[PDB]
């Protein structure tokens, strides 16, 4: 019994240095904050398979599609047997076909036979009630919820010689009132959209609602998410919407509103922890582990943690970890929109000493978002814990253990036509390039055969001569057309700039060509102060620009050289804009436009102010 309570509420929130101290002067850390002390706790997935099989909104009424818990059947009472583990999941086309043992990790068994009982309605929830330790035994009956009816299955004498579970069923009650029910729990006790009733389970499958019922119907809650749970064996129930928790005990006529969650948060999920005292609630904006009180079994609102994520689709599952000194309660919240879990570690001792340790987060598989996560009970400081997930938009279920110590078919469905006459007609082009490339690896190889020849020194003396007079031909039009009052190509010669075999020479040759035009109507843009845009560093030269690609394309090409040469021989001819006039030509085209606009755009056009 620590001290800092409200009576009504009780907080240990997110790293805000919790609100109590006893001042126990015992030289033994003389403080008992709700915050505990230990080392870290990092978690590591053990990824393994178990089994297999408009969008701007989401349906709250659909709950799960699977379940996994140890079941002890009817014939295990008289005989020695105690506890068999099952997993029952929906399958089929629209989610309509509901269908085991543990070696060291939970895997599907030897005879691995799906017991496909057939329905004609969409599966929307699959859950057991659980068990009791005051009853001493385990329940051997499970109930499911569909759109058209409500069903109860009864698991009778699970077999060990054949690994086959024969299943029995009750009467699927259809709807007398046309309103879609939401949640089942037993501890046909069901919650319809706005009202509930108690259903009676029979003993005879060889061939309903009791005389007491209640309702919580709110005219101003709009959602279709409800929930029901039995609380603390008194035959008290707890009923939920997204706005309040009502406590109802149908033993008497006694109804109390406990949670009222309209103002700043909402009720999101509610797991009843197998501890018959402690039960964990997920609100929006806070995580609540409100237990039961020994005086009146009504609600011991215990140490709750302010969770940070704000969302509309959060769930929770919890696993108890039973140590001989104390009881842990790790709580796993998960969302349907992204791929993350969020955990927190609670501890419990004998004097209702609920505490808190810290939080951590890990990730999931990149394809989909999680939609159903369940912990295997594991039959019951180096904390170990294990569980199964299920991701939305994939029908696979994997198994995970946590210890203390991107392909889309839409891009596939865009290619690959089934047109066999058009198959090689497309495929000719991939064989057409088998010809055109091998010429290019061989023709510049003939330029690899020659090395700085005077015969190609002549070929580059001939190069600039048809660059000089071609410039002298491309200059002499622009002077006479200069009075335009309202740049060029450098691909005019289609005889050369194909078979020139030196990078440092032509870099000098264009610098030899740059120096020639001291006159007007001809300026340039320098390559070496601009060629760095591909390497994203300081590249002050054209000759060292090759030297970067020289070490770069060594491994990934057969003989690796003239391909690297030809692209460097391409880019300077790819920026073939060396045909700027002098400064006069755009400056005289500046002055013409401001004359044409009115005197209102004179003051609007002023660069170079400060």
């Amino acid at each position: 019994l620590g001290v800092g309570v409200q009576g009504a509420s009780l907080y240990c929130p997110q790293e805000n240095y919790t609100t109590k101290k006893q001042e126990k002067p015992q030289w033994l850390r003389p403080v008992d904050d709700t915050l505990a002390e230990d080392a870290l706790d990092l978690h590591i997935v053990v990824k393994s398979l178990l089994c297999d099989t408009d969008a701007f909104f989401w349906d709250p009424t659909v709950a799960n599609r699977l379940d996994s818990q140890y079941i002890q059947t009817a014939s295990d009472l008289r005989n020695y047997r105690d506890g068999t583990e099952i997993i029952a999941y929906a399958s089929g086309k629209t989610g309509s076909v509901l269908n085991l043992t543990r070696q060291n990790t939970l895997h599907l068994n030897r005879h691995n036979n799906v017991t496909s009982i057939e329905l004609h309605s969409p599966i929307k929830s699959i859950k057991i009630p659980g068990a009791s330790e005051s009853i001493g035994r385990r329940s051997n009956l499970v109930g499911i919820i569909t759109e058209n009816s409500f069903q109860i299955f009864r698991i009778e004498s699970v077999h060990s010689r054949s690994c086959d579970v024969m299943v029995s069923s009750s009467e699927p009650l259809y709807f007398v009132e046309i309103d879609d029910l939401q949640v089942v729990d037993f501890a046909a006790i069901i919650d319809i959209k706005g009202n509930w009733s108690i259903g009676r389970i029979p003993k005879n499958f060889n061939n309903l609602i009791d005389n007491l019922h209640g309702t919580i119907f709110d005219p101003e809650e709009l959602s279709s998410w409800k929930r029901i749970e039995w609380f603390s064996h008194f035959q008290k129930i707890l009923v939920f919407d997204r706005s309040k928790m009502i406590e109802i005990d149908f033993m008497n006529n006694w109804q109390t509103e406990v949670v009222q969650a309209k103002a700043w948060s909402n009720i999101r999920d509610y797991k009843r922890i197998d501890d018959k005292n402690g039960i964990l609630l997920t609100s929006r904006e806070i995580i609540i582990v409100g237990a039961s009180e020994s005086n009146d079994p009504v609600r011991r609102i215990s140490w709750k943690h302010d969770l940070d994520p704000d969302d509309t689709t959060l769930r929770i599952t919890v696993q108890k970890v039973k140590k001989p000194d104390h009881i842990l309660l790790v709580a796993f919240v998960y969302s349907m929109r992204h791929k993350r879990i969020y955990m927190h570690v609670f501890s419990h001792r004998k004097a209702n000493l609920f505490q808190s340790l810290g939080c951590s987060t890990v990730l999931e598989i990149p394809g989909g978002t999680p939609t159903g996560i369940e912990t295997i009970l594991t039959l019951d400081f180096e904390l170990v814990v294990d569980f199964l997930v299920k991701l939305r938009n994939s029908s696979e279920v994997y198994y995970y253990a946590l210890s203390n110590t991107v392909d889309h078919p839409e891009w596939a469905s865009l290619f690959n036509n089934a047109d066999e006459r058009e198959k090689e007609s497309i495929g000719a082009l991939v064989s057409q390039i088998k010809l055109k490339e091998r010429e290019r690896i061989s023709r510049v190889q003939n330029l690899i055969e020659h090395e700085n020849s005077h015969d190609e020194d002549k070929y580059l003396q001939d190069l600039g001569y048809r660059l000089s007079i071609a410039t002298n031909e491309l200059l002499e039009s622009w002077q006479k057309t200069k009075d335009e009052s309202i740049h060029s190509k450098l691909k005019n010669l289609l005889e050369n700039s194909d078979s020139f075999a030196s990078i440092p020479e032509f870099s000098s040759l264009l610098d030899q060509f740059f120096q020639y035009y001291q006159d007007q109507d001809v300026t340039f843009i320098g390559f070496e102060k601009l060629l760095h845009l591909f390497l994203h560093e300081d590249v002050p030269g054209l000759d060292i620009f090759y030297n970067k690609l020289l070490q770069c394309w060594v491994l990934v090409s057969p003989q690796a050289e003239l391909l690297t040469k030809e692209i460097v021989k391409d880019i300077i001819w790819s920026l073939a804009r060396l045909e700027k006039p002098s400064l006069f030509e755009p400056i005289q085209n500046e002055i013409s436009r401001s004359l044409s606009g009115p005197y209102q755009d004179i003051i609007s056009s002023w660069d170079m102010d400060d």
Partner: protein
């Protein structure tokens, strides 16, 4: 938590909670009619009839910080100054500050006419601040178990 659990050149979080409780001290009434956007009461505002959570974290984490420094007079001088007449948790802290002086001074360092009666002053401050704490609303203390510790301070004194 980041300043306190950094410990290198740290303000230990206590000068920052002092910054929070200086510029967000607002004794104004919660008007309870307007829709609220981007503020929420229970963790970030401090209106009248609701002590701010950074205000009571500044009171817990400077009591615990002053215990670990062995200045308790200076916290007991501050908690004196704000008589939060609407809650019981501040009065439990103000009762627990005097219990820490009544714990520390009850060693007697002998095996003294002023050493005796000062502890009786702190024992009487605890019994009267815990009473006015318990008269207020919901803050359930182990009021039996604390009386076993006050008597134990006097048996060491006799």
């Amino acid at each position: 938590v980041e300043i306190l659990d950094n410990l290198s050149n740290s303000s230990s979080g206590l000068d920052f909670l002092q910054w929070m409780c200086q510029i967000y001290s607002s004794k104004s009434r919660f008007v309870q009619n307007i829709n609220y956007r981007s503020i929420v009461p229970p963790f970030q505002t401090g209106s009248r009839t609701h002590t701010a959570k950074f205000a009571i974290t500044y009171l817990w984490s400077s009591l615990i910080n002053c215990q670990k420094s062995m200045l308790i007079d200076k916290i007991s001088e501050w908690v004196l100054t704000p008589p939060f007449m609407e809650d019981a948790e501040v009065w439990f802290i103000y009762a627990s500050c005097h219990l820490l002086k009544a714990d520390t001074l009850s060693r007697q360092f002998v095996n003294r006419d002023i050493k005796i009666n000062q502890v009786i002053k702190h024992i009487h401050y605890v019994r009267t601040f815990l009473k006015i704490c318990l008269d207020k609303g919901g803050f359930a203390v182990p009021s039996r178990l604390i009386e076993n510790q006050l008597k134990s301070f006097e048996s060491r004194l006799y």
